[PDB]
Amino acid sequence: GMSTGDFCTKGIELVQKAIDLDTATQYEEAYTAYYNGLDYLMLCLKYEKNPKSKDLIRAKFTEYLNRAEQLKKHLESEEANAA
Ligand SMILES: [Cl-]
Known about the structure:
Elements: H1 4-23, H2 27-47, H3 51-82
Helix pairs in contact: 1-2, 2-3
Bound molecules: chloride ion.
């Protein structure tokens, strides 16, 4: 079955998908990918046994949580403006 490392990798892959969609301005789908990747990164952090990996993943978690919050606010503003 999936190792801790496998959960971490799935989170990294989902965040990379989000980053790419973000760059492409596909903000709704980027937000969803950030959300899903961040859940895997939280699981990674809880079980990670390598201290360097844990420190790096924690920094990425905070970085992309903040970006996801920015996209969520942007999407909410767009919805309000369109109404
Ligand atoms: Cl997704």
